Paper text:
Aminoglycoside (3″)(9) adenylyltransferase AadA from Salmonella enterica belongs to the ANT(3″)-Ia family and catalyzes the magnesium-dependent O-adenylation of streptomycin and spectinomycin at positions 3″ and 9, respectively. Modification of streptomycin and spectinomycin by O-phosphorylation or O-nucleotidylation prevents the drugs from binding to their respective binding sites on the ribosome (for reviews, see Refs.
The two molecules of AadA display close-to-identical structures (root mean square deviation (r.m.s.d.) of 0.1 Å over 261 Cα atoms). There are also local conformational changes of the 202–206 loop region directly linked to the interaction with ATP. The ribose is in C2′ endo conformation with both hydroxyl groups involved in hydrogen bonding to Asp-130.
Residue numbers in the entry: 2 to 262
The structure:
Amino acid sequence: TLSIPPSIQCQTEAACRLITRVTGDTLRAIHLYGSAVAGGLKPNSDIDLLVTICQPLTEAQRATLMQELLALSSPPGASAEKRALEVTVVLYSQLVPWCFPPSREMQFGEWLREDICQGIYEPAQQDWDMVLLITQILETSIPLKGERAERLFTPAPAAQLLKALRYPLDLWQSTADVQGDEYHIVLTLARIWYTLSTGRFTSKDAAADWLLPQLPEDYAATLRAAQREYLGLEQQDWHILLPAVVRFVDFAKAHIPTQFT
Ligand SMILES: Nc1ncnc2c1ncn2[C@@H]1O[C@H](COP(=O)(O)OP(=O)(O)OP(=O)(O)O)[C@@H](O)[C@H]1O
Ligand SMILES: [Cl-]
Ligand SMILES: [Mg+2]
Ligand SMILES: [Mg+2]
């Protein structure tokens, strides 16, 4: 059975207790997933949590949850003992049976700290990534509360998983679309490519390793720089590298499979 890294156990139990208390009667399950469970937990890595609830959260619960999580989470890399939390909240009725795309009730994350610390909360909204989240959780997750994933959710049809995997390819078309987030986008494309070719999910680092031998050397060099930075082995000047990142994004759009291999 999958294990929680000892070094995040205390904070993970604190998040679970806070979520449980605030949601109360409406809570159906809490699952830990992502690199803490699947592998590749780096110093900057967040703690990924999915919260399944039965009824929508009141305007008051949402505010309580957001403000409290703010105090349970720290910006990534700030502390080795207090990681960034990502908490995604979803109605059970959006997943069983599936709505495509599913909506998420709310998402807490450090990239939203400046808004969340002012009381500005993203509202419920459609999110194709929820299909990827549940698919990943069905394979690799730990139920902190409620039932194990394979007993709670059902897999999405392959056709919808395909649409969800390819949807972010339209997010990146311009230079400004990718500027500021360069290595993240390069590694995500590597993972998307990996999943479409194998049907499987793997870490950012392993996805880069898998893709590198299949690339012309110019594109492997960009992927290598992105992997290197993510592993903390070298910080590049990504303004200088931006034109090559745009070429890499275009190369992935041209070459990533359009159907599962
Ligand atoms: N093919 C894919 N495989 C995995 N994640 C993918 C893929 N395509 C898109 N993603 C999305 O990218 C995000 C990855 O989340 P996250 O950054 O927490 O990754 P991680 O594996 O936990 O690594 P880290 O340790 O850097 O947090 C999720 O929203 C996930 O659904
Ligand atoms: Cl690890
Ligand atoms: Mg993560
Ligand atoms: Mg995350």
